[PDB]
């Protein structure tokens, strides 16, 4: 449900994620990279299931960050897809894909895959 | 069938893959790059379902190549997972993961992901 997803979260590499869950299924906020810093802040946008199957199932969700802001442009975008699991220690478990803009000849190696776990603070 | 899989297959990049399929499930052969070339050749090994289902379901299969031979060593390895579909235009549809050996600090972006379709033409 919206309330529980809203807040500040951190993953195992030390990155920050700040998010608001709206009543229509929308997600908005900010992703911060290299151990905080002032502006290595980027915009994020996503969607979640607002009427979850409830008994003890997780809530499905996902979001995108394109790595460009007013100071830097890495010419790449990452998408995270996973689930929210409430409890006394709430968690988000994800798998992610990172794609870079390449020339035709290098498109075969444009995408990296990995996984992150987020803890609410 | 095993001898359906047995042969020479080509992907959309020009790479040639030569495989022998054994009756009990073994897969063995050679992979080579640079649309031919002399020792652009590497060894491969794998496994496949030797007793598939009897409606029009494909045959599941997979294999590994480590990228070291007598002349080169790229300190990486690729695995392909997919299925075989027979008939007049037989095909092998796959997705693959490439992992490189890294230092701890570079472990987060060790793995690339992609997809390949192999035909006999």
């Amino acid at each position: 449900a919206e309330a529980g997803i809203t807040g500040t979260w951190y993953n195992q590499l030390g990155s920050t994620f700040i998010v608001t869950a709206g009543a229509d299924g929308a997600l908005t906020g900010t992703y911060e990279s290299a151990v905080g810093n002032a502006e290595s802040r980027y915009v994020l946008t996503g969607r979640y299931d607002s009427a979850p199957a409830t008994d003890g199932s997780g809530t499905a969700l996902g979001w995108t960050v394109a790595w460009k802001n007013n100071y830097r442009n890495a010419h790449s975008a990452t998408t995270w897809s996973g689930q929210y699991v409430g409890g006394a220690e709430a968690r988000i478990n994800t798998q992610w894909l990172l794609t870079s803009g390449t020339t035709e000849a290098n498109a075969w190696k444009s995408t990296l895959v990995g996984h992150d776990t987020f803890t609410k603070v | 069938a095993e001898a359906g899989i047995t042969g020479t297959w080509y992907n959309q990049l020009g790479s040639t893959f030569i495989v022998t399929a054994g009756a009990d499930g073994a897969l063995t052969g050679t992979y080579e790059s640079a649309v031919g070339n002399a020792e652009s050749r590497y060894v491969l090994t794998g496994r496949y379902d030797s007793a598939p289902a009897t409606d029009g379901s494909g045959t599941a299969l997979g294999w590994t190549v480590a990228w070291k031979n007598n002349y080169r060593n790229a300190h990486s390895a690729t695995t392909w997972s997919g299925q075989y579909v027979g008939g007049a235009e037989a095909r092998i549809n796959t997705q693959w993961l490439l992992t490189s050996g890294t230092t701890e600090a570079n472990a987060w972006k060790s793995t690339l992901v992609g997809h390949d379709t192999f035909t006999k033409v």
């Binding site: 030390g14 990279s33 290299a34 830097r72 890495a74 | -």
Partner: peptide, 8 residues
């Protein structure tokens, strides 16, 4: 040093 990674 990509912004999704650690201080790199």
């Amino acid at each position: 040093c990509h912004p999704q990674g650690p201080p790199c």
